[PDB]
Design a protein around this motif. Structure first.
Motif, PDB file in Angstrom:
ATOM      1  N   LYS A  94      -5.239  -7.858  70.285  1.00 13.35           N
ATOM      2  CA  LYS A  94      -6.556  -7.966  71.085  1.00 13.35           C
ATOM      3  C   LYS A  94      -6.346  -7.776  72.342  1.00 13.35           C
ATOM      4  O   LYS A  94      -7.061  -6.401  72.738  1.00 13.35           O
ATOM      5  N   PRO A  95      -5.761  -7.694  74.133  1.00 17.84           N
ATOM      6  CA  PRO A  95      -5.474  -6.872  75.218  1.00 17.84           C
ATOM      7  C   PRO A  95      -4.770  -5.890  74.430  1.00 17.84           C
ATOM      8  O   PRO A  95      -5.729  -5.178  75.221  1.00 17.84           O
ATOM      9  N   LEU A  96      -4.903  -5.123  73.585  1.00 21.49           N
ATOM     10  CA  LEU A  96      -4.251  -3.895  73.410  1.00 21.49           C
ATOM     11  C   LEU A  96      -5.650  -2.834  73.417  1.00 21.49           C
ATOM     12  O   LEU A  96      -5.819  -2.099  73.689  1.00 21.49           O
ATOM     13  N   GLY A  97      -6.411  -3.380  71.753  1.00 26.01           N
ATOM     14  CA  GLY A  97      -7.441  -2.880  72.042  1.00 26.01           C
ATOM     15  C   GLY A  97      -9.114  -2.810  72.982  1.00 26.01           C
ATOM     16  O   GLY A  97      -9.197  -2.136  73.589  1.00 26.01           O
ATOM     17  N   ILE A  98      -8.367  -4.670  73.857  1.00 23.35           N
ATOM     18  CA  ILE A  98      -9.655  -4.089  74.806  1.00 23.35           C
ATOM     19  C   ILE A  98      -9.160  -3.104  76.545  1.00 23.35           C
ATOM     20  O   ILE A  98     -10.114  -3.137  76.889  1.00 23.35           O
ATOM     21  N   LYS A  99      -7.710  -2.871  76.103  1.00 24.38           N
ATOM     22  CA  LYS A  99      -6.807  -2.004  77.495  1.00 24.38           C
ATOM     23  C   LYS A  99      -7.724  -0.095  77.127  1.00 24.38           C
ATOM     24  O   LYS A  99      -7.812   0.122  78.017  1.00 24.38           O
ATOM     25  N   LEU A 100      -7.459  -0.443  75.798  1.00 19.35           N
ATOM     26  CA  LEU A 100      -7.836   0.955  75.233  1.00 19.35           C
ATOM     27  C   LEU A 100      -9.029   1.088  74.732  1.00 19.35           C
ATOM     28  O   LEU A 100      -9.427   1.917  76.099  1.00 19.35           O
ATOM     29  N   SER A 101      -9.798   0.002  74.602  1.00 18.14           N
ATOM     30  CA  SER A 101     -11.525   0.356  75.920  1.00 18.14           C
ATOM     31  C   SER A 101     -12.101   0.886  77.031  1.00 18.14           C
ATOM     32  O   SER A 101     -12.535   1.800  77.202  1.00 18.14           O
ATOM     33  N   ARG A 102     -11.013   0.304  77.693  1.00 18.56           N
ATOM     34  CA  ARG A 102     -11.217   0.596  79.245  1.00 18.56           C
ATOM     35  C   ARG A 102     -10.919   1.234  79.891  1.00 18.56           C
ATOM     36  O   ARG A 102     -11.293   1.893  81.230  1.00 18.56           O
ATOM     37  N   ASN A 103      -9.778   1.542  78.887  1.00 22.87           N
ATOM     38  CA  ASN A 103      -8.925   3.361  79.801  1.00 22.87           C
ATOM     39  C   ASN A 103      -9.084   4.517  78.738  1.00 22.87           C
ATOM     40  O   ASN A 103      -9.006   5.654  79.399  1.00 22.87           O
ATOM     41  N   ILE A 104      -9.441   4.222  77.512  1.00 22.97           N
ATOM     42  CA  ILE A 104      -9.751   5.595  76.744  1.00 22.97           C
ATOM     43  C   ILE A 104     -10.909   6.633  77.713  1.00 22.97           C
ATOM     44  O   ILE A 104     -10.967   7.948  77.024  1.00 22.97           O
ATOM     45  N   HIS A 105     -11.403   6.164  78.351  1.00 20.13           N
ATOM     46  CA  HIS A 105     -12.299   7.532  79.794  1.00 20.13           C
ATOM     47  C   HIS A 105     -11.297   8.462  79.964  1.00 20.13           C
ATOM     48  O   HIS A 105     -11.604   9.819  80.109  1.00 20.13           O
ATOM     49  N   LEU A 106     -10.067   7.887  80.640  1.00 22.48           N
ATOM     50  CA  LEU A 106      -8.725   8.332  80.787  1.00 22.48           C
ATOM     51  C   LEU A 106      -8.151  10.126  80.625  1.00 22.48           C
ATOM     52  O   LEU A 106      -7.378   9.813  80.696  1.00 22.48           O
ATOM     53  N   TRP A 107      -8.350   9.255  78.542  1.00 25.38           N
ATOM     54  CA  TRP A 107      -7.900  10.340  77.489  1.00 25.38           C
ATOM     55  C   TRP A 107      -8.472  11.856  78.202  1.00 25.38           C
ATOM     56  O   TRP A 107      -9.795  11.656  79.236  1.00 25.38           O
ATOM     57  N   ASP A 108      -7.514  12.446  78.116  1.00 23.84           N
ATOM     58  CA  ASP A 108      -7.461  13.958  78.607  1.00 23.84           C
ATOM     59  C   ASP A 108      -6.655  15.473  78.209  1.00 23.84           C
ATOM     60  O   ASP A 108      -5.510  14.061  78.297  1.00 23.84           O
ATOM     61  N   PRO A 109      -7.586  16.004  76.999  1.00 29.44           N
ATOM     62  CA  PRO A 109      -6.306  17.533  76.423  1.00 29.44           C
ATOM     63  C   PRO A 109      -5.868  18.508  77.397  1.00 29.44           C
ATOM     64  O   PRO A 109      -5.812  19.294  76.521  1.00 29.44           O
ATOM     65  N   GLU A 110      -5.293  18.043  78.224  1.00 34.92           N
ATOM     66  CA  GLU A 110      -4.849  18.785  79.620  1.00 34.92           C
ATOM     67  C   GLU A 110      -3.389  18.044  78.964  1.00 34.92           C
ATOM     68  O   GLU A 110      -2.632  18.907  79.401  1.00 34.92           O
ATOM     69  N   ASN A 111      -2.998  16.879  78.934  1.00 34.25           N
ATOM     70  CA  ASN A 111      -1.566  16.162  79.065  1.00 34.25           C
ATOM     71  C   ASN A 111      -1.359  16.401  77.358  1.00 34.25           C
ATOM     72  O   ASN A 111      -2.185  17.238  76.602  1.00 34.25           O
ATOM     73  N   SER A 112      -0.331  15.547  77.142  1.00 38.71           N
ATOM     74  CA  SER A 112       0.639  15.429  75.697  1.00 38.71           C
ATOM     75  C   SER A 112      -0.581  14.595  74.956  1.00 38.71           C
ATOM     76  O   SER A 112      -0.462  13.452  76.164  1.00 38.71           O
ATOM     77  N   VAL A 113      -0.040  13.905  73.696  1.00 37.07           N
ATOM     78  CA  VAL A 113      -0.566  12.836  73.143  1.00 37.07           C
ATOM     79  C   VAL A 113       0.442  11.962  73.393  1.00 37.07           C
ATOM     80  O   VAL A 113      -0.004  10.451  74.293  1.00 37.07           O
ATOM     81  N   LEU A 114       1.424  11.687  74.272  1.00 38.18           N
ATOM     82  CA  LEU A 114       1.869  10.376  74.052  1.00 38.18           C
ATOM     83  C   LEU A 114       2.261  10.325  75.665  1.00 38.18           C
ATOM     84  O   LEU A 114       1.657   9.313  76.325  1.00 38.18           O
ATOM     85  N   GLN A 115       1.902  11.526  76.553  1.00 36.98           N
ATOM     86  CA  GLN A 115       1.222  11.858  78.285  1.00 36.98           C
ATOM     87  C   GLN A 115       0.045  10.283  78.451  1.00 36.98           C
ATOM     88  O   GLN A 115      -0.400  10.564  78.967  1.00 36.98           O
ATOM     89  N   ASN A 116      -0.311  10.549  77.595  1.00 40.11           N
ATOM     90  CA  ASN A 116      -2.100  10.079  77.965  1.00 40.11           C
ATOM     91  C   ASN A 116      -1.760   8.362  76.969  1.00 40.11           C
ATOM     92  O   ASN A 116      -2.864   7.858  77.756  1.00 40.11           O
ATOM     93  N   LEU A 117      -1.125   8.548  76.061  1.00 40.11           N
ATOM     94  CA  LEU A 117      -1.151   7.605  75.525  1.00 40.11           C
ATOM     95  C   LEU A 117      -0.659   5.905  75.746  1.00 40.11           C
ATOM     96  O   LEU A 117      -1.018   5.291  76.113  1.00 40.11           O
ATOM     97  N   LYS A 118       0.454   7.137  76.845  1.00 38.30           N
ATOM     98  CA  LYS A 118       1.416   5.558  77.787  1.00 38.30           C
ATOM     99  C   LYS A 118       0.738   5.397  79.137  1.00 38.30           C
ATOM    100  O   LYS A 118       0.670   4.010  79.555  1.00 38.30           O
ATOM    101  N   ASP A 119      -0.196   5.747  79.248  1.00 33.90           N
ATOM    102  CA  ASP A 119      -1.115   5.630  81.071  1.00 33.90           C
ATOM    103  C   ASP A 119      -2.457   5.089  80.151  1.00 33.90           C
ATOM    104  O   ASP A 119      -3.195   4.217  80.731  1.00 33.90           O
ATOM    105  N   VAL A 120      -2.452   5.569  78.992  1.00 40.15           N
ATOM    106  CA  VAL A 120      -3.820   5.043  78.707  1.00 40.15           C
ATOM    107  C   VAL A 120      -3.889   3.228  78.311  1.00 40.15           C
ATOM    108  O   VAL A 120      -4.067   2.477  78.820  1.00 40.15           O
ATOM    109  N   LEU A 121      -2.565   3.208  77.556  1.00 42.38           N
ATOM    110  CA  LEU A 121      -2.257   1.824  77.172  1.00 42.38           C
ATOM    111  C   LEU A 121      -0.675   0.939  78.365  1.00 42.38           C
ATOM    112  O   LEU A 121      -0.891  -0.063  77.843  1.00 42.38           O
ATOM    113  N   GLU A 122      -0.683   2.151  79.088  1.00 46.36           N
ATOM    114  CA  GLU A 122      -0.089   1.345  80.687  1.00 46.36           C
ATOM    115  C   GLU A 122       1.395   0.660  79.858  1.00 46.36           C
ATOM    116  O   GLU A 122       1.482  -0.654  79.981  1.00 46.36           O
TER     117      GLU A 122
END
Ligand SMILES: [Zn+2]
Ligand SMILES: [Zn+2]
Lengths: 73, 370, 94
Positions: B261-289
């Motif tokens: 539940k909280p992971l889905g919520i946090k993903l929805s609230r942070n998904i706009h901070l997805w950025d295709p100039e970083n790496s997959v892991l470097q975006n997931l870590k700071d998206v999902l906190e």
């Protein structure tokens, strides 16, 4: 000249001069003149297929000669 | 022609009437660049209702499993002309079915030209050649310094037709084959595809090292999906677009209803901070906190992280995925095993692709969505 | 107190035997294939098909292996060891 390795294939044994030591078969040289070489892989990648190619081509050659004798008959 | 004076010559050039009365034919019959011996005796009259047909033993081998067809055709066919027409068409069938008997390389332009072309490439490239010289497998290096292979399967004519190319990477490879194109040509195409994906390879290799990849194990290069583990007994699977890898992938979570539940919520609230100039892991870590575990193998080696129905990890690909919404059980399961259990219970009721009913171990409400 | 003809290889016969193709210890093995050799190196192989028409059909092959074959034998698991005045070669039917 004989198979000292026990591969099946013959090798040549060369004994260098007795000036080195008063001892028999010191300073030897064993060789196949191919791969086996003892004494005192892009290269090794393409020979078997090429040899098989030669053998297939040889079989075809002989087959066509037979085919040709049939037509003469 | 119409009449079997000229039409017979035109369609069986190699049949010589031996007798004056055109009663004994002999000679050859043609099929797929191949003449076969044949001596086809008629009666006094032109009747195939009664007719002998003798062969070479080579021909008898190739007409085994058609003797009835041939005998039928002799009796039912009007003239000799049409008989020979049908017999040839039947040889084309027989040989084209037994296609495994063929593909003999010509001596003049095969074994020489292919070595010339491999010399044109470089001998550090080749990794395998078959003793039929039918299969080859060739190697190339990334800017990253990664090996990617390509198999070719080649015919009696290499340069005439295309070679059958089997290559690892997930998107379909296209090779513009001409008779003028060659091994260096198609190799350059392969390098082009490689350098285009380079980002994709780097993203997925970066994954394989620095996170606990779980549900591919010994992954191929074709694989776009990556079930990563995070915490314990909750996961995230990730299918990524090759052409735009750094772009967001299709993403979802397995695990505990109260954990996920909280992971889905946090993903929805942070998904706009997805950025295709970083790496997959470097975006997931700071998206999902969060950070990942790097293979929690030593400590929880035999903790019983299995189905708790069949007691197995790896049921025919299947991983323990479905868990209990309970702090005291947390027991993982399989889809198959938990369905087969819950299907039985009198307690259980099914909605559209959902099954409600009791966790085996703790008897608390657990939900299964097929 | 009759004699039947099977194939007629054109060249002389050297070895006759039998093999177990698809081998999926016991001395008497129920042999699936039949093998003959020529001198000039025509090999013959035979097998049961029961394929495509729903009826048993005899599958013949007829290969042309190199060199004047001088002798051969059968090894366990559809393998034939045969010999030409150059080398001793093997054939795997399995
Ligand atoms: Zn439970
Ligand atoms: Zn299970």
């Amino acid at each position: 000249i004989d198979d000292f390795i026990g591969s099946g294939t013959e090798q040549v044994l060369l004994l260098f001069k007795d000036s080195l030591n008063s001892d028999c078969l010191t300073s030897f040289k064993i060789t196949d003149l191919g791969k086996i070489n003892y004494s005192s892989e892009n290269r090794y990648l393409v020979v078997p297929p090429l040899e098989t190619g030669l053998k297939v081509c040889f079989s075809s050659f002989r087959e066509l000669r037979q085919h040709l004798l049939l037509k003469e008959k | 022609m119409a009449v079997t004076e000229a039409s017979l010559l035109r369609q069986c050039p190699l049949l010589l009437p031996q007798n004056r009365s055109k009663t004994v034919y002999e000679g050859f019959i043609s099929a797929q660049g191949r003449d076969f011996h044949l001596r086809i005796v008629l009666p006094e009259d032109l009747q195939l209702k009664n007719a002998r047909l003798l062969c070479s033993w080579q021909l008898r081998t190739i007409l085994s499993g058609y003797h009835r067809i041939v005998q039928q055709r002799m009796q039912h066919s009007p003239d000799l002309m049409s008989f020979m027409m049908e017999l040839k068409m039947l040889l084309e069938v027989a040989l084209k079915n037994r296609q495994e008997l063929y593909a003999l390389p010509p001596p003049p332009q095969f074994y020489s030209s292919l070595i010339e072309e491999i010399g044109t490439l470089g001998w550090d490239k080749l990794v395998y050649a078959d003793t039929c010289f039918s299969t080859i497998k060739l190697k190339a290096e990334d800017a990253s310094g990664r090996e990617h292979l390509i198999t070719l399967k080649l015919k009696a004519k290499y340069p005439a037709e295309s070679p059958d190319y089997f290559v690892d990477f997930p998107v379909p490879f296209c090779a513009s084959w001409t008779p003028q194109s060659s091994l260096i040509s198609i190799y350059s195409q392969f390098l082009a595809a490689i350098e285009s994906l380079k980002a994709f390879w780097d993203v997925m290799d970066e994954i394989d090292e620095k996170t606990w990849v779980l549900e591919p194990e010994k992954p191929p290069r074709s694989a776009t999906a990556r079930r990563i583990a995070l915490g314990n007994n909750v996961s995230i699977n990730i299918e990524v677009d090759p052409r735009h890898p750094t772009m967001l992938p299709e993403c979802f979570f397995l695990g505990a209803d109260h954990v996920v539940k909280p992971l889905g919520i946090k993903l929805s609230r942070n998904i706009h901070l997805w950025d295709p100039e970083n790496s997959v892991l470097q975006n997931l870590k700071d998206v999902l906190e969060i950070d990942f575990p790097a293979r929690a193998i030593l400590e929880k080696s035999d903790f019983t992280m299995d189905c708790g129905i069949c007691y197995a990890y790896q049921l025919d690909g299947t991983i323990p995925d479905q868990v209990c919404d309970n702090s005291q059980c947390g027991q993982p399961f399989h889809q198959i095993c938990l369905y087969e259990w819950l299907r039985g219970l009198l307690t259980s009721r099914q909605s559209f692709n959902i099954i409600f009913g009791e966790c085996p171990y703790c008897s608390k409400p657990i939900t299964l969505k097929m | 107190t009759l004699v039947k003809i099977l194939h007629h290889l054109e060249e002389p016969v050297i070895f006759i035997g039998a093999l177990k193709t698809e081998p999926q210890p016991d001395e008497d093995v129920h042999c699936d294939c039949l093998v003959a050799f020529g001198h000039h190196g025509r090999m013959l192989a035979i097998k049961a098909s029961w394929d495509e028409s729903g009826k048993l059909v005899p599958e013949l092959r007829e290969y042309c292996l190199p060199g004047p074959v001088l002798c051969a034998a059968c090894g366990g698991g559809g393998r034939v060891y045969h010999s030409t005045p150059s080398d001793l070669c093997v054939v795997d039917l399995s």
